[PDB]
Amino acid sequence: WLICEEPTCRNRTRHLPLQFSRTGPLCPACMKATLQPE
């Protein structure tokens, strides 16, 4: 899941310019962990 938060979940912030995959059924609450680094 560390590979999820930093590289792939930062690319889910590239979904945030669109914001329909805000909910996103892939990983349990893993975009806020990317902000523990950002």
Swiss-Prot record:
Domain commentary = The CysA-type zinc finger is required for PCNA-binding.
Physiological role: Catalytic subunit of the DNA polymerase alpha complex (also known as the alpha DNA polymerase-primase complex) which plays an essential role in the initiation of DNA synthesis. During the S phase of the cell cycle, the DNA polymerase alpha complex (composed of a catalytic subunit POLA1, a regulatory subunit POLA2 and two primase subunits PRIM1 and PRIM2) is recruited to DNA at the replicative forks via direct interactions with MCM10 and WDHD1. The primase subunit of the polymerase alpha complex initiates DNA synthesis by oligomerising short RNA primers on both leading and lagging strands.
Tell me its family. Belongs to the DNA polymerase type-B family.
Amino-acid positions noted as binding Zn(2+) 2 in the UniProt annotation, renumbered to this chain: C4, C9, C27, C30
Q: Where is this motif: CysB motif?
A: 4-30
**Name of the featured protein:** DNA polymerase alpha catalytic subunit
Counting on the full-length protein, the chain here runs from 1345 to 1382 of 1462
Q: Where is the signal peptide?
A: none
Q: Could you tell me the superkingdom of the organism this chain comes from?
A: Eukaryota
Organism the protein comes from? Homo sapiens
Q: What else is known?
A: In eukaryotes there are five DNA polymerases: alpha, beta, gamma, delta, and epsilon which are responsible for different reactions of DNA synthesis.
Localization per Swiss-Prot or TrEMBL: Nucleus; Cytoplasm, Cytosol
Write down the disease named in this UniProt entry: Pigmentary disorder, reticulate, with systemic manifestations, X-linked: An X-linked recessive disorder characterized by recurrent infections and sterile inflammation in various organs. Diffuse skin hyperpigmentation with a distinctive reticulate pattern is universally evident by early childhood. This is later followed in many patients by hypohidrosis, corneal inflammation and scarring, enterocolitis that resembles inflammatory bowel disease, and recurrent urethral strictures. Melanin and amyloid deposition is present in the dermis. Van Esch-O'Driscoll syndrome: An X-linked recessive syndrome characterized by different degrees of intellectual disability, moderate to severe short stature, microcephaly, hypogonadism, and variable congenital malformations.
The subunit structure is: Component of the alpha DNA polymerase complex (also known as the alpha DNA polymerase-primase complex) consisting of four subunits: the catalytic subunit POLA1, the regulatory subunit POLA2, and the primase complex subunits PRIM1 and PRIM2 respectively. Interacts with PARP1; this interaction functions as part of the control of replication fork progression. Interacts with MCM10 and WDHD1; these interactions recruit the polymerase alpha complex to the pre-replicative complex bound to DNA. (Microbial infection) Interacts with SV40 Large T antigen; this interaction allows viral DNA replication.
